[PDB]
Design a protein around this ligand. Structure first.
Ligand SMILES: Nc1nc2c([nH]c(=O)n2[C@H]2C[C@H](O)[C@@H](COP(=O)(O)O)O2)c(=O)[nH]1
Ligand SMILES: [Mn+2]
Ligand SMILES: [Mn+2]
Ligand SMILES: [Mn+2]
Length: 156
């Protein structure tokens, strides 16, 4: 039995493109990713996801929808990362670079998998098919998956 810490991840997914951010520092630096971070005390998970989206990309959205949950375990770390993944297609402003992230749009036939976390190759296709998922990935370091589970679910 391990304890887990709550994190969010937000994908701005439009009909032909997705917004990703190049992580400029910290965890997963150097990889394109959705926007997110630790959930803070008192806020709902969804509101924490909205907050991190605004902080990291400048975008303000009224609502998100839950699309998945991924649990990450790292060799040598007792604490699991419980990542709650959200989408929206509805935005109303322009992305702006923050200290954490440089946003960039990618066409949906140019998803930059080689420059994303390795696990994204497994679950991101489900997100694109509008399927809900639960995943678990155990990493050695940043690059090597030792064990994983991925399942489509009807509710997140
Ligand atoms: N796409 C993707 N995102 C991840 C993985 N692991 C991981 O912590 N994240 C996200 C969750 C959070 O949005 C962010 C980590 O929190 P910070 O932004 O506070 O460093 O990275 C992963 O393997 N793939
Ligand atoms: Mn953040
Ligand atoms: Mn972050
Ligand atoms: Mn934060």
């Amino acid at each position: 039995m391990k304890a887990s810490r709550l994190y969010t991840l937000v994908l701005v997914l439009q009909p032909q493109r997705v917004l990703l951010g190049m992580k400029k520092r910290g965890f997963g630096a150097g990889r394109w990713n959705g926007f997110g971070g630790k959930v803070q005390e008192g806020e709902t998970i969804e509101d924490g996801a909205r907050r991190e989206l605004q902080e990291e990309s400048g975008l303000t959205v009224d609502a998100l929808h839950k699309v998945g949950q991924i649990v990450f375990e790292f060799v040598g770390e007792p604490e699991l990362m419980d990542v709650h993944v959200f989408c929206t297609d509805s935005i109303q402003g322009t992305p702006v670079e923050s200290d954490e992230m440089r946003p960039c749009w990618f066409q949906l036939d140019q998803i930059p998998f080689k420059d994303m976390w390795p696990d994204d190759s497994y679950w991101f296709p489900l997100l694109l098919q509008k399927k809900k998922f639960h995943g678990y990935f155990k990493f050695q370091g940043q690059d090597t998956i030792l064990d994983y589970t991925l399942r489509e679910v009807d509710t997140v």
